[PDB]
Amino acid sequence: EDSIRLYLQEIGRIRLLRADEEIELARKIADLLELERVRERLSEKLERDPRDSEWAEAVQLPLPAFRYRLHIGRRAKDKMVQSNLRLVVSIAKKYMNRGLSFQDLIQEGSLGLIRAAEKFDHEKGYKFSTYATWWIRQAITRAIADQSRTIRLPVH
Amino acid sequence: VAELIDDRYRTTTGGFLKFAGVEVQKKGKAKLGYEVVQGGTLLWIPEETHEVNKDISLLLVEDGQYVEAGTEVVKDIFCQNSGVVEVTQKNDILREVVVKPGELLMVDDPEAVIGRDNTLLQPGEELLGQVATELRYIQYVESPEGPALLSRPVVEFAVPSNPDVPSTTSVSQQTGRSIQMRAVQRLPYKDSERVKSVEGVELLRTQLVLEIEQEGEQEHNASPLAADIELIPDLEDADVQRLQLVILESLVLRRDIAADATQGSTQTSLEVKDGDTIVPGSVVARTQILSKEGGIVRGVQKGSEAVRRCLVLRHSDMATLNISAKPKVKAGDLIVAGTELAPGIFAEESGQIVGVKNYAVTIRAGRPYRVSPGAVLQIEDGDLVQRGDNLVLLV
C-alpha cells in the first residue's frame, strides 16, 4: 500500500526514451495540437465549434482518418508525459519534504508536465531536460504556495 | 597492480584504426585484459567526431563538398575539425556528423580513383600522377559531387611485448607460490573501429598484473585469495621501491599470559625466522599451564585437552586421615559422614576412601547427591565438574 511506490513500480514499467524517439513525437503532437486550434477557430467563429464531423474540422479529411490523425497526434503527448514520469518525481520529491505531499506533488508536476509537454519545440534542439523541467518546477511551486497552508496568503 | 604511461600508440583526437597487423584475440578481451602479442603494426586515421541527434535542421556543413577543416560551427555545433565532413540523415533528422580529419582533396574524371580508391594509398604512390607522403588513406569512395580524393593522415604503430624491467626480481617464497611479474599491455580495439573525438590514448597500456600461480596449500593456499601486499622495504641505499607482491598467512595466538588456576595457563614460543618459507613446515605456538595444586592428574583422555577435566590430587583432594582403628580398612568407598569408617568408629567423609593405610587413611570427598528416580540429568562420572556447572536436574 506504499501508494508512492504502488505508482512508482508501475511507472517503472514504462520505459524511458531518447531525443530521436521523442522527435517522431514532437511533430505528431504539433500535428494534433494545431489541428485542434483549428477546431477552436472554427469554434469561435461558428456554431461555437465545428464539432460535427470531418467538419468537426473545417479541414478536409476522410473522416475516419481524422480521428486517427488526432489519436496519433495526441497519443504522442500521452506516450510522452508518461514516457517521462521519472525526473519529474526527482523534482517533485524535492517538494515532498518542502510540503504538500509526495503524491500531491507528483501530480502537480504532472500537470505541468503536460503543459510543457506540449509547449515545446524540437527545433531548438536542446532536450526538454533543459525546458520540461522548467515548467515543472513552476507547477509545483504553485501548489505548496497555492495551498498546503491552510490560510492562503499572497503567494507574491 | 601497476599502471604504465605512454603517449605512443595513443591516437590524436579520435579516428579509425585501419591498422594492418598486431595480434591479440577476441580473447574474451579483444577488450580490456590484453596480452598484446605482436605489433609493428597499428595504423590510425585519428579523426574528429561529432555525433548528435537533432533534426535535419541546421548546417549544410557537408561532404561531397567538405567543409571547413577548420573552425566552423556545424548544425549549431563546432569542431576543431581537421577535415571533410559527413552527415547522417538516416532519420528524417539525424544523429551524428563527423569531420573527417585532413586535407580535403580534389579530383574529377571520377572513374580514375573511384576505380582506384578502396585502399588507403600510399606515399610515393602518386594520385593520378600526384605523389604521396603517408600510407595515405585515400578515400575508399572518392569524395561526392564529383571532385576529391580523401587523405586523413594515417600513423602506424608497433609493439612487441615489454620494455625492460629495471634491477627487479619479482619473487615470493616461490615454492610453487608463483608470485612473479607480468606487464599487462593493452589496446582497446581494431581495424574495423572508428573512434570518437579526443584520443583513444590507450591502445597500448601496461597496466601490470602480478599473478600468484600454483594450487598447493601448505605454502600457497588461497588461489583466488592469496593476495598481494605492498610495504616500503628497500628504502635505504636503493631506497627506490622494490614493490612487494608479498602475500600472506599472518595468524595469531591469544594472551600467552592468561595464566589461571583451573584454566590451563599459558607459556609460549614462536618459531620464526623473518624471511623463510614459513620457517619450513612450521610448528608455531605454546601454552603451558598451571594446576590448582600439584597432585595425581587422572580423569584424563590421552591426547589433547578438548575437555576441561583432569585431577590434580592430594590426600585431601583425595581425602585421607587417621584411623584410630587398625591398619584396617578397604578400597574406594564413597563415605557419608559416620558410616562404619574407622571401623568401630565413624567420621565425616563423603566419597572415595581409597584405603585407610601409624594409621593413615585415604578417604576422598565425593558427594552423594542422592537423586531420585526420574531425573532430567546433566552429566557424568569422571567429568571433573566445573564450579557450579549445572549438573543433573530432576524434573
XYZ file of C-alpha atoms in Angstrom:
551
model
C 0.000 0.000 0.000
C 3.072 2.280 -0.397
C 0.937 4.319 -2.885
C 4.038 6.394 -3.842
C 5.782 3.119 -4.744
C 2.475 1.441 -5.772
C 2.579 4.024 -8.609
C 6.417 4.158 -8.713
C 6.532 0.491 -9.584
C 4.439 0.741 -12.287
C 5.777 3.759 -13.889
C 8.915 1.895 -13.917
C 7.174 -0.374 -16.152
C 7.115 2.141 -18.738
C 10.405 2.780 -20.259
C 12.461 5.717 -20.983
C 13.147 7.191 -24.417
C 15.670 9.382 -26.320
C 15.533 12.703 -28.266
C 15.233 10.922 -31.668
C 12.445 8.663 -30.273
C 10.853 11.795 -28.699
C 11.217 13.609 -32.086
C 8.719 11.483 -34.037
C 6.626 12.668 -31.320
C 7.182 16.202 -31.400
C 5.900 16.593 -34.886
C 2.835 14.315 -34.279
C 1.992 16.275 -31.071
C 2.109 19.557 -33.062
C 0.221 17.816 -35.936
C -2.580 17.237 -33.367
C -2.109 20.419 -31.492
C -2.554 22.790 -34.203
C -5.235 20.746 -35.683
C -7.330 21.443 -32.877
C -6.866 25.047 -32.798
C -8.431 24.857 -35.990
C -11.072 23.209 -34.085
C -11.271 26.137 -31.877
C -11.102 28.654 -34.661
C -13.956 27.104 -36.283
C -15.442 27.023 -32.909
C -15.184 30.600 -32.182
C -16.360 31.777 -35.474
C -19.190 29.456 -35.693
C -21.802 27.319 -34.045
C -19.153 27.858 -31.394
C -17.484 24.643 -32.553
C -17.066 22.715 -35.823
C -17.529 19.825 -33.557
C -19.563 17.974 -36.072
C -17.559 15.596 -38.238
C -14.856 15.775 -40.819
C -16.315 19.094 -40.322
C -15.727 18.961 -36.682
C -12.904 20.170 -38.669
C -13.345 22.757 -41.225
C -10.488 20.964 -42.604
C -10.749 18.404 -45.249
C -10.093 14.841 -44.266
C -11.505 11.468 -44.818
C -13.240 11.374 -41.647
C -12.032 8.154 -40.116
C -8.529 9.215 -40.816
C -9.186 12.435 -38.937
C -9.927 10.821 -35.543
C -6.921 8.577 -36.373
C -4.604 11.562 -37.098
C -5.934 13.049 -33.816
C -5.154 9.790 -31.926
C -1.501 9.560 -33.142
C -1.029 13.348 -32.776
C -2.031 13.426 -29.077
C -1.107 9.775 -28.296
C 2.447 11.129 -28.805
C 1.961 13.537 -25.835
C 0.287 10.799 -23.720
C 3.098 8.404 -24.817
C 5.456 11.276 -23.806
C 4.194 12.782 -20.495
C 4.066 9.234 -19.006
C 7.134 8.265 -21.111
C 8.999 10.805 -18.902
C 7.323 10.136 -15.488
C 10.693 9.837 -13.626
C 12.826 13.042 -13.276
C 9.531 14.892 -12.555
C 9.382 12.686 -9.404
C 13.089 13.521 -8.867
C 11.859 17.170 -8.992
C 8.513 16.814 -7.116
C 10.216 14.692 -4.385
C 12.332 17.809 -3.581
C 8.971 19.378 -2.526
C 7.712 16.114 -0.952
C 9.711 17.334 2.087
C 9.196 21.052 1.272
C 5.471 20.408 1.943
C 2.222 19.380 0.171
C 2.705 15.575 -0.123
C 4.973 13.351 -2.279
C 1.849 12.184 -4.200
C 0.306 15.702 -4.090
C 3.474 16.880 -5.763
C 3.626 14.298 -8.213
C 0.546 15.376 -9.628
C 1.298 18.840 -9.765
C 4.175 18.263 -11.720
C 2.277 16.207 -13.881
C 0.086 18.968 -14.698
C 2.954 20.945 -15.696
C 4.427 18.144 -17.464
C 1.699 18.281 -19.723
C 1.736 21.743 -20.414
C 5.292 21.772 -21.235
C 4.903 18.561 -22.931
C 3.418 20.340 -25.462
C 4.603 23.749 -25.344
C 7.797 22.594 -26.514
C 9.821 22.825 -29.534
C 12.209 20.410 -31.015
C 13.762 22.988 -33.006
C 15.691 24.250 -30.587
C 17.169 21.283 -30.315
C 18.364 21.042 -26.819
C 16.439 18.388 -24.926
C 13.328 19.003 -22.780
C 15.599 18.176 -19.785
C 16.525 21.896 -20.130
C 12.883 23.075 -20.601
C 10.355 20.448 -19.433
C 11.910 20.748 -16.056
C 11.272 24.205 -16.176
C 7.609 24.020 -16.416
C 7.534 21.524 -13.859
C 9.154 23.448 -11.271
C 6.798 26.083 -11.879
C 3.834 23.979 -11.497
C 4.916 22.812 -8.402
C 5.802 25.735 -6.530
C 2.314 26.943 -7.398
C 0.627 24.399 -5.058
C 2.509 24.347 -1.720
C 2.233 28.150 -2.144
C -1.313 27.935 -3.622
C -2.329 25.871 -0.529
C -0.517 23.484 1.893
C -1.213 26.320 4.263
C -4.491 26.359 5.487
C -4.828 30.088 5.136
C -3.900 31.113 1.548
C -1.597 34.196 1.711
C -0.376 36.365 -1.240
C 1.998 33.841 -2.924
C 3.820 37.031 -4.071
C 48.875 -3.757 -9.902
C 50.736 -1.030 -11.729
C 49.902 1.427 -14.455
C 52.171 2.456 -17.262
C 52.216 5.740 -19.143
C 52.968 6.116 -22.805
C 51.971 8.799 -25.270
C 52.977 6.342 -28.008
C 50.357 4.286 -29.897
C 47.742 6.656 -28.385
C 45.956 8.426 -31.348
C 45.417 12.218 -31.715
C 41.691 13.132 -31.380
C 39.543 10.043 -32.194
C 39.623 8.304 -35.622
C 39.500 4.929 -37.438
C 42.292 2.472 -36.820
C 42.638 0.895 -40.181
C 45.654 -0.815 -38.794
C 47.353 -3.687 -40.512
C 48.716 -6.455 -38.284
C 49.170 -6.742 -34.485
C 47.983 -9.931 -32.862
C 45.707 -10.152 -29.831
C 42.471 -12.208 -29.908
C 38.864 -11.606 -29.211
C 40.250 -13.364 -26.204
C 37.194 -12.586 -24.164
C 39.075 -9.343 -24.116
C 39.701 -8.112 -27.554
C 38.657 -5.655 -24.907
C 40.490 -4.857 -21.638
C 42.742 -7.664 -20.388
C 45.430 -7.587 -23.127
C 48.352 -9.946 -23.984
C 49.234 -7.666 -26.893
C 51.229 -10.204 -28.868
C 52.840 -8.669 -31.833
C 52.769 -5.352 -33.498
C 54.865 -3.198 -35.564
C 51.522 -2.833 -36.711
C 48.834 -0.387 -35.836
C 47.779 2.440 -38.128
C 45.258 5.084 -37.450
C 43.104 7.681 -39.020
C 42.700 9.848 -35.892
C 39.673 11.836 -36.638
C 37.284 14.340 -35.386
C 33.944 13.057 -34.301
C 30.630 14.948 -33.641
C 27.606 12.775 -33.430
C 24.307 14.194 -32.375
C 20.633 13.613 -32.616
C 18.637 16.511 -33.758
C 16.732 17.201 -36.825
C 17.929 17.758 -40.218
C 17.544 21.338 -39.242
C 20.710 23.364 -39.165
C 24.054 23.245 -41.084
C 24.907 22.045 -44.535
C 28.254 21.540 -43.381
C 28.912 18.706 -45.722
C 30.877 16.134 -47.683
C 30.713 15.689 -51.408
C 31.694 19.130 -50.557
C 33.861 19.037 -47.405
C 33.512 21.835 -45.187
C 35.911 23.760 -43.063
C 38.575 21.540 -41.546
C 38.844 24.472 -39.681
C 36.793 26.004 -37.035
C 33.250 26.394 -38.321
C 30.105 25.740 -36.361
C 28.012 22.916 -37.804
C 24.315 22.395 -37.171
C 24.782 24.760 -34.299
C 27.956 22.882 -33.296
C 31.708 23.210 -33.934
C 34.765 21.414 -34.394
C 38.379 21.738 -34.061
C 37.923 19.844 -37.180
C 40.705 18.613 -39.230
C 38.747 17.916 -42.277
C 35.992 16.794 -44.598
C 32.785 16.137 -43.002
C 29.946 13.751 -43.218
C 26.275 13.822 -42.312
C 23.961 11.163 -41.170
C 20.486 11.905 -42.123
C 19.202 8.451 -41.775
C 16.449 9.505 -39.651
C 14.440 12.324 -41.127
C 16.536 14.143 -38.556
C 19.969 12.968 -37.881
C 22.062 11.695 -35.123
C 25.660 12.303 -35.985
C 28.227 14.275 -38.038
C 31.879 13.535 -38.439
C 34.538 15.891 -39.507
C 36.969 13.842 -41.401
C 40.500 14.658 -40.411
C 42.655 16.012 -43.100
C 43.057 17.917 -46.298
C 40.186 17.792 -48.488
C 41.177 16.641 -51.839
C 40.372 17.415 -55.389
C 39.593 15.392 -58.481
C 37.410 14.742 -61.373
C 37.019 12.206 -64.121
C 35.940 10.043 -61.199
C 36.456 6.590 -62.678
C 40.105 7.132 -62.062
C 40.369 6.507 -58.370
C 36.742 5.694 -57.820
C 38.260 2.982 -59.941
C 41.469 3.038 -57.908
C 40.403 4.099 -54.365
C 39.385 1.451 -51.972
C 42.562 1.281 -50.461
C 44.480 3.590 -48.220
C 47.017 4.783 -50.546
C 50.412 5.177 -50.441
C 53.234 7.659 -50.232
C 55.010 7.903 -53.425
C 52.262 6.176 -54.899
C 51.100 9.241 -56.708
C 47.435 10.399 -57.009
C 46.916 10.026 -60.773
C 50.336 11.423 -61.217
C 50.493 13.110 -57.795
C 52.901 11.542 -55.326
C 52.145 10.894 -51.701
C 53.524 11.022 -48.184
C 51.989 8.555 -45.727
C 50.322 5.267 -46.413
C 47.752 7.734 -47.339
C 44.386 6.564 -46.540
C 42.878 7.724 -49.664
C 39.074 7.718 -49.638
C 37.803 4.191 -50.413
C 34.887 6.112 -52.027
C 36.314 9.213 -53.832
C 34.513 12.370 -52.493
C 30.970 13.015 -53.902
C 29.631 15.938 -56.046
C 32.497 14.577 -58.116
C 35.650 16.125 -57.111
C 38.098 14.957 -54.369
C 40.022 12.005 -53.049
C 40.266 11.718 -49.204
C 43.542 11.584 -47.277
C 43.065 11.665 -43.472
C 46.772 11.341 -42.452
C 47.467 7.795 -41.128
C 50.053 6.783 -38.482
C 51.009 3.139 -37.926
C 52.152 1.754 -34.651
C 54.189 -1.080 -33.139
C 54.540 -3.389 -30.223
C 56.224 -6.383 -29.279
C 55.894 -7.005 -25.716
C 57.569 -5.474 -22.742
C 60.183 -2.795 -22.440
C 62.835 -3.555 -19.856
C 62.086 -4.171 -16.149
C 64.774 -2.350 -14.060
C 67.029 -4.119 -11.471
C 63.973 -6.094 -10.267
C 63.263 -9.635 -9.004
C 59.535 -10.417 -8.844
C 59.551 -13.069 -6.179
C 57.684 -14.785 -3.374
C 58.520 -17.686 -1.228
C 58.083 -19.245 -4.697
C 57.971 -22.952 -3.901
C 55.054 -23.118 -6.285
C 53.643 -19.957 -4.884
C 54.294 -18.175 -8.081
C 54.379 -14.509 -7.324
C 56.096 -13.038 -10.102
C 55.572 -10.348 -12.689
C 53.512 -9.685 -15.681
C 53.265 -6.492 -17.684
C 49.688 -6.440 -18.898
C 49.619 -4.364 -22.036
C 46.584 -3.176 -23.632
C 44.729 -1.919 -26.666
C 41.096 -1.095 -26.899
C 40.094 -2.242 -30.337
C 40.729 -2.943 -34.036
C 40.695 -2.265 -37.842
C 37.083 -2.138 -38.011
C 36.581 0.577 -35.393
C 36.338 4.358 -35.826
C 36.784 6.204 -32.560
C 35.286 9.405 -31.210
C 36.786 12.776 -30.948
C 39.554 13.172 -28.337
C 42.109 10.315 -28.082
C 41.916 6.606 -27.542
C 45.243 7.109 -25.873
C 45.121 3.627 -24.652
C 45.939 1.253 -27.353
C 48.893 0.115 -25.534
C 48.763 0.234 -21.863
C 50.852 -1.545 -19.495
C 48.918 -1.958 -16.538
C 50.653 -4.578 -14.549
C 49.011 -7.706 -13.234
C 51.315 -9.691 -10.947
C 49.824 -13.227 -10.815
C 50.212 -15.830 -7.999
C 50.258 -19.270 -9.734
C 50.262 -22.930 -8.463
C 47.447 -24.564 -6.403
C 49.467 -26.030 -3.483
C 48.309 -25.094 0.049
C 50.984 -25.808 2.682
C 52.701 -22.760 1.210
C 50.386 -21.010 -1.247
C 46.775 -21.773 -0.400
C 44.410 -19.012 -1.384
C 44.253 -19.303 -5.130
C 41.674 -16.554 -5.524
C 42.623 -15.124 -2.172
C 46.395 -15.375 -1.511
C 46.585 -11.773 -2.395
C 49.373 -9.338 -2.891
C 50.560 -6.783 -0.395
C 52.957 -3.923 -0.553
C 55.086 -2.123 2.023
C 58.111 0.209 1.549
C 61.233 -2.027 2.023
C 64.475 -1.500 0.028
C 64.187 2.155 1.190
C 67.878 2.736 2.100
C 70.875 2.606 -0.305
C 68.423 1.538 -3.054
C 65.567 3.483 -1.336
C 63.864 3.186 -4.779
C 60.869 0.979 -4.030
C 61.074 -2.601 -4.943
C 57.420 -3.399 -4.863
C 56.494 -6.396 -2.828
C 53.955 -8.714 -4.206
C 54.016 -10.307 -0.787
C 51.028 -12.395 0.199
C 50.063 -13.790 3.496
C 49.123 -16.058 6.253
C 49.885 -13.949 9.369
C 47.943 -15.748 12.102
C 47.680 -15.116 15.874
C 47.622 -16.614 19.308
C 45.911 -15.476 22.455
C 47.414 -13.768 25.530
C 50.250 -16.300 26.230
C 49.988 -14.693 29.722
C 46.372 -15.711 30.537
C 47.613 -17.839 33.486
C 44.775 -19.127 35.749
C 44.165 -21.748 38.497
C 41.589 -24.048 36.816
C 42.244 -22.633 33.306
C 45.283 -24.392 31.807
C 47.633 -21.440 31.692
C 49.840 -20.015 29.095
C 53.506 -20.182 28.158
C 54.666 -19.959 24.830
C 57.036 -19.627 21.885
C 57.259 -18.623 18.274
C 59.298 -20.439 15.805
C 60.062 -17.564 13.495
C 62.741 -16.521 11.364
C 61.704 -13.465 9.374
C 62.216 -14.395 5.777
C 61.670 -18.118 5.307
C 59.145 -20.318 3.626
C 57.150 -20.048 6.718
C 60.065 -21.458 8.561
C 59.609 -24.651 6.832
C 56.603 -26.757 7.854
C 56.325 -24.740 10.897
C 55.181 -25.736 14.403
C 54.268 -22.450 15.917
C 52.940 -21.947 19.376
C 52.816 -22.949 23.028
C 50.597 -22.599 26.051
C 51.908 -24.165 29.260
C 49.603 -24.346 32.159
C 49.249 -24.137 35.942
C 47.366 -26.567 38.088
C 45.251 -25.593 41.113
C 47.604 -27.816 43.035
C 50.376 -30.356 42.437
C 48.938 -33.893 42.603
C 47.859 -37.051 40.713
C 46.139 -35.951 37.447
C 43.603 -38.661 36.450
C 40.217 -38.316 34.700
C 42.304 -37.762 31.574
C 41.515 -38.557 27.916
C 45.005 -39.329 26.467
C 45.530 -36.756 23.662
C 44.759 -33.001 23.705
C 42.502 -31.220 26.258
C 39.254 -30.710 24.275
C 37.668 -31.391 27.717
C 38.330 -29.268 30.782
C 38.714 -32.086 33.316
C 41.819 -33.540 34.936
C 42.561 -34.275 38.597
C 45.404 -32.862 40.448
C 45.356 -34.584 43.794
C 46.275 -34.625 47.354
C 45.453 -36.606 50.486
C 42.564 -34.285 50.827
C 41.708 -33.627 47.220
C 41.772 -37.318 47.569
C 40.985 -37.049 51.229
C 42.843 -39.133 53.815
C 43.181 -39.052 57.562
C 43.972 -41.146 60.595
C 42.046 -44.236 61.552
C 42.319 -44.704 65.220
C 41.095 -48.129 64.214
C 43.654 -50.551 62.927
C 45.644 -50.953 59.789
C 42.073 -51.674 58.921
C 40.001 -50.747 56.000
C 39.333 -51.270 52.315
C 39.411 -49.630 48.889
C 37.464 -46.788 47.386
C 34.241 -46.225 49.135
C 32.090 -43.176 48.948
C 31.631 -42.319 52.601
C 28.738 -40.343 54.092
C 29.712 -38.948 57.465
C 29.887 -41.544 60.157
C 29.328 -44.823 58.420
C 31.382 -47.826 59.585
C 34.572 -45.990 58.808
C 37.260 -46.093 61.379
C 35.823 -49.420 61.767
C 34.311 -49.490 65.133
C 34.489 -45.695 64.554
C 32.753 -43.272 62.203
C 33.672 -39.850 60.789
C 32.973 -37.291 58.144
C 33.724 -38.055 54.635
C 31.543 -38.390 51.513
C 33.383 -40.154 48.773
C 36.197 -42.461 47.996
C 38.162 -43.763 50.789
C 40.712 -45.487 48.756
C 42.180 -47.196 51.786
C 42.828 -46.467 55.392
C 46.546 -47.175 55.456
C 50.564 -45.370 62.074
C 47.009 -45.088 60.912
C 46.927 -43.187 57.557
C 43.588 -43.061 55.770
C 42.927 -42.214 52.118
C 39.366 -41.140 52.176
C 38.182 -38.900 49.456
C 35.437 -36.418 49.120
C 32.870 -37.186 46.508
C 29.462 -36.068 47.480
C 26.390 -38.160 47.133
C 23.631 -36.013 45.897
C 21.155 -38.777 46.122
C 18.799 -38.278 43.194
C 15.561 -39.513 42.576
C 14.234 -41.885 40.153
C 13.312 -39.613 37.417
C 15.938 -37.055 36.531
C 16.424 -34.941 33.510
C 20.082 -35.169 34.111
C 23.125 -33.335 33.019
C 26.460 -35.125 33.312
C 28.759 -37.895 34.120
C 31.316 -39.816 36.014
C 34.878 -38.662 35.698
C 33.762 -35.416 34.094
C 35.610 -33.253 36.557
C 32.850 -30.838 37.182
C 33.324 -27.166 36.789
C 32.481 -24.987 39.588
C 28.765 -24.806 39.829
C 28.400 -26.289 36.358
C 24.927 -27.257 36.183
C 24.797 -30.928 36.788
C 21.822 -33.238 36.752
C 18.425 -31.750 37.162
C 15.390 -33.761 38.036
C 12.082 -32.681 36.639
